[PDB]
């Protein structure tokens, strides 16, 4: 009686739940992802997690419809975290418009979009996030905010070194952006 997945939503934590279209003709149900066959689930999710990684603006755009925008993988990441991490100002603003939860914390460390944009040193994204209204005071599972984490990474980057000198200017700008919110 499983015809296809025609929707999704997250449940509890790191756990998907899908809307089922039955062939035999009854009402659509919601089911725990583990109730249905793996390769059914896979063909549904795989496009999303592919696009998220390639930070593909338009794929994401059409895949949006009945899918939950904050669909989470097994580590509690959503496509917003991946795209923040890759620097796609666009994919961030797209997912933002669609209604993605800016303050989402993953479960392998408590990280958020901002922590990722700061971590992978993504100044433009950090700007977009603050501007779209992300909460900059949110803390990761070490208590560190996004800002503190830039500070912490910066400290440990070799100072009089011509090779890591690029990241240096990078981290500074991240910090410029965020501090302009606190002070």
């Amino acid at each position: 009686e499983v015809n296809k997945i025609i929707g999704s939503r997250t449940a509890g934590e790191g756990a998907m739940e899908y809307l089922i279209e039955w062939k035999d003709g009854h009402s659509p149900s919601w089911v725990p992802s583990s109730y249905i066959a793996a390769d059914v689930v896979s063909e549904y999710e795989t496009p999303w997690w592919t696009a998220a990684r390639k930070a593909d603006e338009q794929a994401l755009s059409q895949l949006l419809e009945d899918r939950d925008v904050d669909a989470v993988d097994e580590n509690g990441r959503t496509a917003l975290l991946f795209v923040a991490g890759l620097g796609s100002d666009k994919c961030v603003r797209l997912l933002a418009e669609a209604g993605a939860d800016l303050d989402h914390r993953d479960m392998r460390g408590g990280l958020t979009a901002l922590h990722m944009a700061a971590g992978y040193v993504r100044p433009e994204v950090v700007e977009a996030l603050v501007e779209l209204g992300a909460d900059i005071e949110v803390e990761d599972e070490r208590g560190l905010t996004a800002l503190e984490l830039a500070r912490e990474i910066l400290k440990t980057t070799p100072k009089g070194n011509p090779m890591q000198f690029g990241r240096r200017i990078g981290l500074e700008k991240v910090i410029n952006v965020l501090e302009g919110q606190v002070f």
Binding site: R77, G109, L111, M116, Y120, I153, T156
Partner: peptide
């Protein structure tokens, strides 16, 4: 951190 190292995602 392990140095400057930071790839919680896995992009390497």
């Amino acid at each position: 951190y392990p140095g400057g190292s930071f790839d919680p995602l896995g992009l390497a």
